[PDB]
Design a protein. Structure first.
Lengths: 334, 1407
């Protein structure tokens, strides 16, 4: 299946899924065809004039006939659905063919659990069957916390908020009264009862939101998405009680995410604290075999695995995670 | 070979090294050295790999079980002759367990061989000196050779330098075993030769090592140097080797001879071998030279005069300065080498003309040349000056004390290339900017700290340094932007890491441009600027490393001086029967090589047994793949030989100080006013570095040709700088720019509506604006419009803070406000200039529609957190807008959001920390509690000599304090809380959190805190979690180090804690009733001062509080009822105490007022002090060494030690006899059952004890052995003092010599117990030297006393015997005391030193 472009008024780097290419002002680019019909997809944009953010549209070719059109008024490329079937079918070799599937089956592995109908609940815009995301969009969680922490109320567009599941480790939702220490140190209740059983119903829906967070983080450099992705990883790793199939499936999921992550975005994406905790101290520190290996390979510096530089300039304060030593008896050389 | 060694070793009477005995005195120490060396490798690294960890765990086991390991090891030396295979990569990995026996053997051999003088003075490296110092010694030694520079009679000097080719590689094992058996036990020999004869695995091939030393074995150094000695002996012959070494009963120092005639008796004046590099300095008279040459030319004719061809010379020197190839000198050089080469079988080593340099000094050759340890050296004698200031050594004739020669130094070509490849390697890697900087730094420092003054003379190296530094910069720049910058601020490179810079160290000429030296500060009263043009000082360069490292010459001259001084000071102290105190050397501590500081390190008595330590460090290259670049110095032996702290200080200052540096960063954007030093071998991620420095990197002076404005903001981007756009997008997410604008305008509207009347305002209208208006950067419109009741008389336009307006400018009835936001960069962020220009531009705009000719443009720079305003004012308006902007800038919640997101992006890190800055709020009306959890989980510790640590928990408490009211909620945590629980240090935090939230619950809404401030950061999560039902209570951390932990030094608090038998809440006012007379603020400063003192020196602080016993503590109080006048004194005393103790630790005297956090017989003083002695019992150190079951073990009951210390004195020695008996069926275990307090007259450094008490009449005294005596002292010694010996002998010489001396070093904080036996020589000297009062005296020897084995135990208890009169302390009854007295005794309770029985009565006030 096929997404035509009406034209290409302005110079822009275009991405589809994990692919990318440049289009020049008024290049005769008439879109993309032979798009693999199975998956969700994302077609995204960064204008050569460095003034723009990254933006994009998630869609599913099975849900309709979709095409891209520049809107000079708004100054961006817009997805649209061709309502009139015959009208579309009318709308040669500058229609480029989507590539043959790599040996990895990379995109499926990144989007295995991602579903358009799930996307559409996180990005809320009813009139459309495709979903618009960009770099600047905040989360419903952040928007809530703001007003919580806090004349003209005049709303923000709800479609410009990412309605990710609210995950907050220091919340009443996460911590049962009378089980404060238990629930904070072992997040199994929050994961299994509140999240998996309560909200997501199953591990497929969990993984979908996790995979979608990641990809919005990667494609758009969206802050709330990188946060959500880390928080959903940390929630599993911080639970002593997790279904076996989730742990095995997570290892693979993360492996592919870290494999596909371009070096040049890793700084911004990866959270040093979360990755060190999950891998080396959490309940699930032994459980992510393949992810540990690829991370230690691509990003040792992040994990303190860069195996030794000279103290230049030549202090100590007392330690919280030991007892306070009142006194002692010490046998030793004088 | 071997014939030479036999003749040599017999000539030396060499005493073969035995197999290590079962009870080898040092075996212990030898083992720790070996294992410490083995661990060392893991000191650096945090996350271990598997085998790294597995290896480490092996060593620790070995360490944790010493004597087992010793017996394993000696077993394998005795019997093991087949071994695991060795992996190589050349670096050798040897089976971890083998390495233990091997490193143990290494140490044993080097120690014993050093003791036995196996290796003569010429063999290097020597523990004696670092390599640069060898080179120096060698050049001085040459200069000091008798007549060496004389060419009157056609003399010649010849310096031959070459390599013993393949020395290690051709070692023959059968020969090696034979050789070893001359010097070591034959079983050690067999071990050694067998251990070389093992399988080596490389790639896929393995092969049995048939010959060749394996350099990676830990004792390879020993072999290599022993073998080298064989070759030295061939080169030198027995006689000359004997001249050089000196007689084995009186050996020569390196290069020294017994007389001048022996020096001159042989042409070989000097010899040295550094591993496989030999140096030979010959001297010839004209005849001997020609003789030798003719003999050579006979074998090897050179008719055509070709001998200059292929004659190695030193290219690093100018042509005139290198050796001149004059035919006579060239033939002498070749003849000397020919002679030398002939002396050594090629089966031992390959000596080739091609790898030799032969420098000839003569009437035709004024320079003597050599290369050593990386240095090219050229000696020019003054007399030859006719024949000059960089990298030069002055060579002084020791006899005339005149400078007779200069040594010129350069860094060798080889070492220049090595450094060049290190830098090229950095650039050529797989990295964070900081990591690249840190590698540059390591390489630079490694180069400079070694080669020092040689560098400045080496122009090709200066060039490489400069080019290398530029390439490091260029790498950072290319990472920052394809485009590459017009110019670049040096602040980003050379600012230290603590301030977020790369902390590069420079070796280059770098201008700091004046334009980079501007900074500004916003105050309440206005904006202050600094620019370079304002001062008349020097133009600023980045400091370079050149001038921060003391030259080797100055180190060495100063070392000679401070070590002579030390010897002299030590002599002088010994002359007064004293030991030299370290305080007398304070001031030469960081001088000397070794550093004088080494004399007083704790590990010193053990390092004494670490021999071969230099070569051992150098050979690590063969057995570890990554080693320190500082392979040539060892800080345990050498001390620290550089210190670059002044560099950091100077770079900061040159860059314009903190203030200037931070103006280049996003620091002001965070909304912090003051620097405090808090970001986090850890790197700054490139993203973060980029963001932090963005104001100075992302500006038009750095990048041009690509200027755009970022959608949804007014931020400009001056190129595609990696990561920055996204960082900034994230910061301003969800239309924050527009929201800040709207939010600020809303605030101003609110304020205006509160002033309708006061300012005759009719109405205030909030305009509605285009969506993007807040970030239309080239036109504007009004945001607020304002209607006059009647009329306004307004000024012509002026700035917000200009003070002197004239309101005669215009009449108006409509005033507008335009709130402008900008995001400034380093080039342009002057908000005053900006708002004036924008106002004057926009108001004469034909596109900005303002609704009247009169109004005010307000401006806020979001990047620099500064503001101003310009336009028309009427009376009252300017001060209102002043106050309003002051409050808006602090409080606006959208600005708050901006600053948090900036702080997040920078990983600064959240409720606001408590701070000096906001400290004062503690005393507003907002109710607040401090929580300190430090004393919640407390233990006492038992550590045995092994390393086993048992803790036991004692009662603790939660310290929760209202700093405004002084109310202290002290929750007692009884030990039962911990019973059966695990992970106690984590549980402690949650238990604290639970107990605090319960306290808050128990208070009525009235009194519930608004904030809880936790002293320790690990309390944050647990308390936030436990306070979820109280969302309006903020939990705050603090950076302040508050001294609440010292609360348990307040007796009345200790007492209730220690007495509690269940959980309990006790309420206190920690301010007593101070608030009747003083403020909360003042009470808290006083509390904090008092607790700081108690924390810093409990004893002194409690002395201060206890001085006047007339001033008491009310029953419902914690502190004494001082007057105001007395509190002033007390306070000042504690200020002093703190800083005394601070100068007594950091060595400082008196400095800048920045702040932090009748006569005779005053026995009364010491009597109060003595009531504090019990505190010292909290840390008890017992002198201990490896259990020997052959020896007695003496067991002192805890209860007797307790009582002994309680009754003792802070200054005066107190003594008693100990009695006991061997346990049942345990002859070796001698239990102390009774202490006998005996009449005595004590002194500071001694005690007159009366004689062995006759106690035969008392019951239970059947059985009781006299065991010896026990006493306090105030000096810490590793031996029995001369005075102890004198006293011990007097007591025991004629009666029971096996009596021990238990000496207790009593000091604030602790007691240290040492038990000793006294030798018969000990006893002899004591007889000769009666009534000795000093630590030393003529004849005295530490070795008079030997370590006795002492245990404490609380399983047994003792009792006391006392004089029947109860009195024992005769200080105040001297005349009544008779030391030869025959006293009587009874069981009882010894009075304390200054009990009333012992001292003058004190008149009190008839209550």
């Amino acid at each position: 299946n096929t997404v035509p472009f009406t034209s290409a008024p302005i110079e822009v780097t275009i991405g589809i899924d994990q692919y990318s290419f440049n289009v020049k002002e008024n290049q005769p680019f008439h879109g993309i065809k032979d798009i693999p019909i199975g998956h969700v997809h994302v077609i995204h944009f960064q204008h050569a004039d460095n003034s723009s953010m990254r933006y994009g549209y998630w869609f599913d070719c099975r849900m309709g006939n979709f095409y891209i059109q520049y809107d000079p008024k708004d100054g961006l490329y817009k997805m649209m659905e061709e309502r009139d079937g015959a009208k579309f079918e009318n709308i040669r070799q500058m229609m480029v063919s989507y590539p043959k599937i790599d040996e990895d089956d990379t995109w499926y592995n990144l989007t295995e659990f991602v579903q358009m109908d799930k996307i559409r609940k996180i990005v809320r815009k009813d009139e459309n069957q495709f979903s618009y995301v960009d770099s600047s969009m905040t989360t419903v969680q952040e928007n809530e916390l703001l007003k919580s922490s806090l004349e003209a109320k005049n709303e923000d567009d709800p479609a410009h908020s990412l309605n990710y599941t609210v995950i907050n480790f220091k919340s009443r939702e996460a911590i049962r009264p009378g089980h404060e220490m238990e629930d904070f140190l072992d997040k199994s209740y929050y994961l299994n009862t509140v999240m998996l059983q309560g909200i997501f119903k199953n591990s497929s829906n969990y993984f979908g939101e996790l995979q979608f967070a990641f990809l919005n983080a990667m494609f758009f450099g969206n802050y709330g998405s990188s946060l959500q992705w880390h928080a959903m990883i940390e929630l599993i790793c911080s639970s002593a009680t997790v279904p076996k199939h989730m742990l095995d499936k997570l290892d693979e999921i993360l492996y592919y995410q870290i494999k596909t992550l371009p070096e040049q975005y890793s700084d911004i994406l990866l959270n040093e604290r979360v990755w060190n905790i999950c891998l080396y101290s959490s309940f699930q520190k032994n459980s992510l075999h393949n992810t540990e290996k690829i991370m230690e390979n691509k990003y040792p510096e992040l994990l303190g695995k860069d195996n030794d530089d000279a103290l230049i300039y030549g202090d100590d304060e007392d330690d919280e995670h030991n007892p306070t030593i009142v006194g002692g008896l010490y046998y030793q050389r004088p | 070979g071997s014939g030479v060694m036999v003749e040599w070793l017999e000539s030396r009477s060499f005493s073969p090294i035995p197999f290590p005995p079962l009870t080898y005195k040092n075996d212990t120490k030898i083992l720790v050295l070996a294992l410490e060396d083995l661990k060392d490798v893991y000191a650096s690294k945090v996350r271990l790999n598997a085998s790294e960890r597995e290896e480490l765990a092996l060593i620790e086991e070995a360490y944790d079980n010493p004597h087992d390991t010793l017996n394993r090891i000696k077993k394998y030396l005795l019997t093991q002759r087949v071994f695991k295979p060795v992996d190589i990569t050349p670096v050798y990995s040897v089976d971890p367990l083998e390495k233990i026996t091997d490193a143990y053997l290494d140490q044993y051999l080097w120690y014993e061989a050093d003791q036995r003088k196996l290796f003569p003075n010429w063999i290097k490296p020597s523990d004696s000196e670092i390599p640069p110092l060898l080179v120096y010694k060698w050049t001085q030694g040459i200069n000091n050779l008798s007549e060496i520079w004389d060419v009157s009679r056609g003399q010649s000097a010849v310096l031959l330098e070459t390599t013993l080719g393949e020395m290690a590689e051709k070692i023959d094992f059968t020969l090696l075993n034979r050789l070893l058996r001359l010097i070591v036990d034959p079983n050690i020999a067999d071990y050694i030769t067998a251990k070389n004869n093992v399988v080596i695995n490389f790639k896929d091939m393995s092969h049995v090592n048939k010959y060749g030393l394996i350099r990676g074995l830990k004792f390879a150094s020993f072999i290599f140097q022993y073998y080298g000695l064989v070759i030295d002996l061939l080169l030198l012959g027995q006689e000359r080797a004997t001249d050089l070494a000196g007689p084995a009963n009186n050996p020569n120092e390196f290069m020294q001879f017994k007389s001048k005639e022996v020096e001159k008796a042989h042409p070989i004046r000097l010899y040295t071998r550094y591993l496989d590099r030999i140096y030979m300095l010959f001297h010839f008279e004209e005849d001997e030279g020609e003789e030798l040459t003719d003999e050579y030319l006979a074998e090897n004719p050179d008719p055509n005069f070709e001998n200059s061809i292929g004659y190695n010379n030193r290219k690093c020197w100018p042509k005139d300065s290198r050796m001149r190839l004059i035919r006579q000198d060239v033939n002498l050089g070749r003849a000397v080498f020919w002679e030398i080469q002939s002396r050594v079988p090629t089966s031992l080593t390959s000596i080739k003309w091609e790898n030799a340099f032969v420098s000839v000094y003569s009437k035709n050759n004024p320079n003597l040349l050599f290369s050593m340890c990386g240095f090219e050296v050229r000696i020019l004698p003054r007399q030859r000056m006719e024949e000059n200031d960089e990298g030069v050594w002055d060579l002084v004739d020791e006899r005339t004390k005149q400078r007779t020669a200069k040594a010129y130094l350069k860094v060798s070509e080889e070492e220049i290339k090595k450094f060049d490849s290190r830098i090229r390697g950095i650039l050529m890697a797989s990295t964070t900017f900081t990591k690249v900087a840190a590698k540059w730094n390591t390489s630079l420092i490694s180069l400079f700290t070694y080669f020092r003054e040689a560098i400045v003379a080496t122009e090709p190296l200066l060039d490489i340094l400069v080019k290398g530094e530029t390439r490091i910069q260029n790498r950072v720049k290319l990472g920052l932007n394809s485009k590459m910058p017009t110019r670049f601020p040096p602040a980003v490179f050379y600012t230290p890491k603590e301030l977020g810079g790369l902390g590069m160290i420079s070796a280059s000429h770098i201008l700091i441009p004046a334009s980079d030296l501007s900074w500004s500060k916003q105050t309440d009263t206005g904006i202050t600027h600094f620019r370079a043009g304002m001062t008349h000082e020097d133009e600023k360069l980045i400091p370079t490393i050149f001038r921060y490292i003391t030259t080797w010459e100055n180190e060495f001259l100063d070392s000679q001086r401070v070590w002579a001084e030390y010897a002299t000071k030590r002599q002088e102290a010994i002359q007064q029967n004293r030991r030299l105190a370290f305080e007398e050397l304070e001031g030469s501590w960081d001088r000397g090589i070794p550093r004088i500081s080494t004399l007083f390190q704790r590990d010193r008595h053990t390092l004494a047994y670490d021999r071969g330590h230099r070569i051992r460090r150098e050979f690590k290259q063969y057995s570890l793949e990554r080693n320190s670049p500082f392979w040539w110095t060892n800080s345990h032996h050498d001390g620290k030989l550089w210190n670059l702290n002044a560099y950091r200080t100077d770079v900061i200052q040159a860059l314009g100080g903190i203030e200037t540096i931070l103006e280049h960063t996003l620091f002001k954007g965070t909304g912090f006013n003051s620097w405090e030093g808090l970001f986090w071998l850890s790197q700054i991620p490139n993203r973060r570095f980029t963001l932090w420095w963005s104001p100075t990197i992302n500006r038009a002076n750095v990048y041009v040709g690509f200027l755009v404005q970022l959608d949804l903001t007014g931020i400009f981007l001056h190129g595609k700088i990696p990561t920055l756009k996204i960082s900034l997008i994230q910061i301003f997410r969800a239309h924050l720019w527009q929201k800040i604008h709207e939010s600020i305008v809303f605030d101003i509207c609110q304020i205006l509506d509160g002033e309708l009347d006061v300012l005759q305002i009719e109405s205030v209208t909030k305009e509605t604006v285009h969506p993007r208006k807040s970030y239309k950067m080239n036109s504007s419109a009004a945001d607020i419009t304002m209607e006059s009741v009647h009329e306004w008389e307004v000024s012509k336009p002026s700035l917000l803070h200009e003070t002197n307006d004239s309101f005669k400018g215009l009449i108006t009835n409509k005033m507008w406000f335009d709130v402008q936001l900008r995001y400034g960069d380093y080039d342009s962020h002057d908000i005053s200039r900006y708002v004036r220009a924008k106002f004057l531009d926009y108001t004469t705009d034909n596109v900005s529609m303002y609704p009247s000719p009169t109004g005010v443009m307000i401006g806020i720079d979001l990047a620099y957190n500064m503001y101003d305003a310009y336009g028309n004012w009427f009376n009252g308006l300017k001060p209102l807008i002043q106050n309003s902007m002051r409050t808006i800038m602090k409080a606006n919640p959208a600005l708050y959001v901006l600053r948090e997101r900036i702080r997040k992006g920078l990983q600064i890190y959240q409720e606001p920390f408590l701070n000096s800055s906001n400290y004062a709020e503690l005393f507003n009306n907002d109710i607040k509690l401090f929580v300190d959890d430090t004393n919640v989980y407390r233990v006492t510790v038992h550590k045995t000599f092994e390393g086993n640590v048992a803790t036991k928990a004692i009662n603790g408490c939660i310290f929760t304090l209202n700093p405004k009211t002084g109310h202290l909620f002290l929750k007692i945590i009884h030990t039962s809380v911990w019973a059966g629980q695990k992970r106690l240090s984590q549980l402690a935090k949650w238990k604290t959190a639970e107990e605090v939230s319960a306290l808050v619950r128990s208070l009525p809404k009235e009194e519930q805190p608004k904030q809880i401030i936790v002293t320790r950061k690990a309390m944050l999560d647990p308390l936030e979690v436990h306070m979820l039902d109280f969302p309006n209570i903020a939990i705050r951390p603090t950076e302040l180090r508050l001294p609440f932990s010292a609360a348990m030094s307040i007796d009345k608090l200790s007492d209730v804690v220690m007495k509690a038998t269940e959980p309990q809440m006790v309420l206190f006012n920690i301010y007593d009733d101070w608030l009747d007379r003083i403020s909360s603020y003042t009470a808290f400063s006083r509390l904090t001062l008092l607790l700081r003192a108690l924390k810093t020196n409990e004893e002194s602080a409690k002395m201060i509080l206890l001085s006047d016993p007339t001033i008491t503590i009310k029953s419902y109080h914690l502190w004494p009822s001082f007057t105001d006048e007395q509190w002033i004194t007390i306070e000042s005393q504690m200020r002093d105490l703190i800083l005394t103790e601070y100068g007594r630790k950091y060595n400082v005297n008196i400095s800048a007022l920045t702040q932090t956090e009748s006569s005779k017989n005053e026995w009364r003083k010491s009597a109060i002090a003595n009531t504090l002695l019990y505190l010292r019992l909290k840390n008890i150190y017992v002198s201990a060494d490896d259990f020997v079951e052959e020896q007695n073990v003496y067991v002192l009951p805890k209860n007797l030690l307790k009582k002994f210390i309680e009754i003792s004195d802070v200054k005066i020695q107190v003594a008693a006899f100990i009695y006991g008996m061997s346990a049942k069926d345990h002859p070796k275990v001698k239990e102390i059952k009774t202490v006998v307090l005996v009449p005595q007259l004590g002194h500071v450094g001694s005690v007159q004890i009366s004689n062995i008490p006759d106690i035969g009449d008392l019951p239970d005294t059947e059985g009781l052995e006299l065991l010896g005596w026990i006493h306090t002292q105030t000096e810490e010694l590793k031996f029995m003092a001369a005075s102890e010996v004198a006293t011990h002998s007097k007591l025991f010489a004629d009666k029971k010599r096996d009596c021990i001396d238990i000496s207790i070093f009593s000091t604030p904080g602790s007691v240290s117990l040492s038990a000793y036996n006294l030798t018969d020589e000990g006893y002899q000297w004591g007889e000769e030297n009666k009534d000795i009062m000093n630590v030393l005296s003529e004849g005295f020897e530490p070795t008079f006393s030997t370590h006795a084995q002492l245990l404490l135990s609380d399983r047994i208890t003792g009792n006391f015997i006392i004089p029947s009169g109860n009195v024992w302390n005769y200080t105040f009854m001297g005349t009544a005391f008779n030391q030869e007295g025959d006293y009587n005794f009874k069981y009882g309770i010894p009075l304390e030193f200054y009990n009333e029985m012992h001292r003058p009565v004190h008149f009190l006030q008839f209550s």
